[PDB]
Amino acid sequence: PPAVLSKSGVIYGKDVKDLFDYAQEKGFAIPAINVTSSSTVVAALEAARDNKAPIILQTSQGGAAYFAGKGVDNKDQAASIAGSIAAAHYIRAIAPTYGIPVVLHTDHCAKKLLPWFDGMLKADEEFFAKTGTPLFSSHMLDLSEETDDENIATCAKYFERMAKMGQWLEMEIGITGGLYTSPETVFAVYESLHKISPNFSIAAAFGNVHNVQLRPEILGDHQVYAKKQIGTDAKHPLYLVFHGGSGSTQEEFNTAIKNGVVKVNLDTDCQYAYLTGIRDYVTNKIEYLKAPVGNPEGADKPNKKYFDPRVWVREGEKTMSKRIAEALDIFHTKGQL
Amino acid sequence: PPAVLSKSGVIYGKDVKDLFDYAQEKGFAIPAINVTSSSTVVAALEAARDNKAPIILQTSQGGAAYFAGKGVDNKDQAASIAGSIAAAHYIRAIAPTYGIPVVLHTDHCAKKLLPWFDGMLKADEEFFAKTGTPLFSSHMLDLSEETDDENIATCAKYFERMAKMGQWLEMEIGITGGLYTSPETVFAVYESLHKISPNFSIAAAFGNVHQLRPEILGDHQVYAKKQIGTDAKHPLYLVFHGGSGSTQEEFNTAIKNGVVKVNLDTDCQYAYLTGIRDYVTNKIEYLKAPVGNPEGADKPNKKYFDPRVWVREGEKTMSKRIAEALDIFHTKGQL
Ligand SMILES: O=C[C@H](O)COP(=O)(O)O
Numbered sequence: 001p002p003a004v005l006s007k008s009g010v011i012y013g014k015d016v017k018d019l020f021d022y023a024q025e026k027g028f029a030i031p032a033i034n035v036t037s038s039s040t041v042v043a044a045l046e047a048a049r050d051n052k053a054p055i056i057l058q059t060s061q062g063g064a065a066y067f068a069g070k071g072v073d074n075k076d077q078a079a080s081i082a083g084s085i086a087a088a089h090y091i092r093a094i095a096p097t098y099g100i101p102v103v104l105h106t107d108h109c110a111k112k113l114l115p116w117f118d119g120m121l122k123a124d125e126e127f128f129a130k131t132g133t134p135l136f137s138s139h140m141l142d143l144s145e146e147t148d149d150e151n152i153a154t155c156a157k158y159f160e161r162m163a164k165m166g167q168w169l170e171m172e173i174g175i176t177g178g179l180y181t182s183p184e185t186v187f188a189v190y191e192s193l194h195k196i197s198p199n200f201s202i203a204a205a206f207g208n209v210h211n212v213q214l215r216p217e218i219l220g221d222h223q224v225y226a227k228k229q230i231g232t233d234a235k236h237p238l239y240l241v242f243h244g245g246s247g248s249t250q251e252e253f254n255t256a257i258k259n260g261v262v263k264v265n266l267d268t269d270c271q272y273a274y275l276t277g278i279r280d281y282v283t284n285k286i287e288y289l290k291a292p293v294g295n296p297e298g299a300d301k302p303n304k305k306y307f308d309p310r311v312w313v314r315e316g317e318k319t320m321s322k323r324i325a326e327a328l329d330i331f332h333t334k335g336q337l
Numbered sequence: 338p339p340a341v342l343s344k345s346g347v348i349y350g351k352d353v354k355d356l357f358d359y360a361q362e363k364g365f366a367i368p369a370i371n372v373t374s375s376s377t378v379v380a381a382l383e384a385a386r387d388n389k390a391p392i393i394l395q396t397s398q399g400g401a402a403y404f405a406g407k408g409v410d411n412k413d414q415a416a417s418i419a420g421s422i423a424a425a426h427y428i429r430a431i432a433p434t435y436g437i438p439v440v441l442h443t444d445h446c447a448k449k450l451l452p453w454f455d456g457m458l459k460a461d462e463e464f465f466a467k468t469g470t471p472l473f474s475s476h477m478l479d480l481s482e483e484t485d486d487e488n489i490a491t492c493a494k495y496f497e498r499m500a501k502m503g504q505w506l507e508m509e510i511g512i513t514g515g516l517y518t519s520p521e522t523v524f525a526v527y528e529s530l531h532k533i534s535p536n537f538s539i540a541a542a543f544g545n546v547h548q549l550r551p552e553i554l555g556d557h558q559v560y561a562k563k564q565i566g567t568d569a570k571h572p573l574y575l576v577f578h579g580g581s582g583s584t585q586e587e588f589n590t591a592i593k594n595g596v597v598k599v600n601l602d603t604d605c606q607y608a609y610l611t612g613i614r615d616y617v618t619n620k621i622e623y624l625k626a627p628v629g630n631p632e633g634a635d636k637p638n639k640k641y642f643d644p645r646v647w648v649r650e651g652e653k654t655m656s657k658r659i660a661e662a663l664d665i666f667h668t669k670g671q672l
């Protein structure tokens with residue numbers, strides 16, 4: 001067990017790596033939950049603390065923009081940069097309060113959206129200039145719609161800006177430049193990035209879209225390739241990330257983790273869960289009228305105790321946390337702290 | 338006009354004062370909203386911007402705790418401290434990009450709740466130690482239930498720790514002694530606090546339990562003029578608590594007498610509910626995950642159940658209601 005398992009709050013640099021290394025070692029993966037509000041942040045932080053598990057909390061470009069407010073325009077990425085950095089502050093401030101270690105990350109960033117990645121890494125650098133630590137734990141680039149050789153050229157240039165602050169980077173690659181992704185194209189990315197820093201993870205195409213069936217076994221192939229191309233004893237010389245894995249079998253997850261996946265993304269199954277408990281507050285339908293709670297007093301009995309947001313929102317957090325709990329069990333992440 | 342009405346973000350020290358002076362000068366009160374989540378902060382921060390008016394975002398003891406989480410133990414004020422600091426930072430970071438000047442306040446803190454006020458203050462001064470600004474812009478102390486002597490004294494003791502960081506202090510005073518609140522007892526507050534720093538606000542008891550006699554605020558003002566001899570018809574910064582529900586002309590009489598912030602909570606809580614409750618209308622496309630209307634049970638609810646769509650409805654309704662109230666307070670359009 002490294003330092004991280006006993007840490008509290010968001011984590012950075014080597015610590016991130018330790019965690020992932022640990023993850024591979026004991027054979028669990030860590031859920032990365034998308035968050036859109038302080039409330040949803042809480043929901044997940046609480047789940048992780050209640051289940052003695054570390055957690056990755058990420059914000060997508062939309063998510064980030066929501067942290068900002070849906071009323072700020074995004075014509076130049078302003079909303080996601082503002083939002084993203086405010087979320088990073090809030091997350092940083094509260095995370096320590098739960099007993100666990102947290103990885104603050106950002107989801108899918110394509111070429112089209114590179115401005116956002118600029119803004120965020122702008123802050124990272126100046127935060128590092130003040131604290132000795134970046135704002136976010138990691139960041140992601142999704143340039144899989146471009147060409148493999150371009151794709152890693154943009155990851156490279158970025159990843160050497162990033163390595164100055166020991167930041168982690170995750171990049172996704174698919175079947176385009178020069179079906180599923182070849183053990184070779186994976187090794188190509190590791191070959192061009194590992195020279196810089198070891199703080200990188202890969203999202204490969206393997207029958208998981210975000211006709212084409214899921215083949216987690218391919219991830220094993222990616223490992224046995226680099227293993228041989230480096231001549232290491234290391235079973236898992238790659239840090240692998242599972243996108244769109246929602247609703248798969250338990251043994252699909254198994255083969256993916258045993259094949260060294262350390263991070264599964266959860267997003268829309270949490271969204272539904274969040275709504276689920278707040279929606280069940282349609283059971284206080286007539287109590288959702290301003291001053292008159294029909295049940296006991298027609299129009300002369302106040303219902304501030306029914307419509308206080310800290311009663312019904314909380315009901316939604318509870319059901320979101322519960323579904324995150326299910327996931328911490330499934331990925332063997334529960335009880336590793 | 339001073340520097341404040343140009344700036345964007347959260348304000349501190351002298352700039353908080355400048356703001357309040359203008360308030361009483363041009364005859365408007367700035368709405369103090371109680372937020373409980375990034376979401377509600379948005380509603381407030383946006384309705385302010387859209388109406389080209391500044392705003393006060395406040396956090397109550399229970400709302401602060403809600404910003405940390407209802408699952409974090411609060412026996413020791415733990416949850417209210419952490420939540421406050423985290424909300425502080427969030428509002429700090431996001432407020433800029435909304436283009437308004439914002440005062441970062443904490444609501445009613447009673448005697449038994451002083452541990453909370455302690456923790457915030459520690460953080461405050463430790464922030465000041467790194468930035469030459471505190472974390473929070475302003476703070477509140479509700480000690481009304483105590484005897485008025487012990488009220489003013491305890492406000493003093495904290496005020497001076499607080500004045501070292503140019504921080505503002507609001508205090509509540511009632512009918513406890515040591516019926517409405519006397520001009521004298523309010524002046525006693527002034528006489529005791531102006532000795533440390535002029536950065537202090539007063540909520541006084543005038544038939545607003547938590548019927549209305551707003552004219553009494555004036556008496557508090559006339560009186561104090563006498564007792565210091567100054568031209569100024571507004572020697573005091575007064576706060577209107579329990580405002581949700583009074584007539585427009587009550588609010589008007591209250592501004593006359595020099596109130597510069599009107600606390601709003603429960604009408605926003607309902608305003609925020611409204612739009613989300615009105616998603617009792619799409620309940621058949623939000624009861625499953627797949628079962629849509631326009632097809633048996635093989636469709637995508639994802640764009641209906643996404644919280645980004647349905648909490649935005651609520652923030653909108655709350656934003657509207659914040660709008661109404663910043664109009665009636667004649668604060669809409671001072672930028
Ligand atoms: O701080 C004072 C409270 O916010 C009063 O407002 P309310 O009348 O909305 O409860």
Ligand SMILES: [Zn+2]
Pocket residue numbers: 108142172203210243
């Ligand atoms: Zn992807």
Ligand SMILES: [Zn+2]
Pocket residue numbers: 445479509540547578
């Ligand atoms: Zn009060």
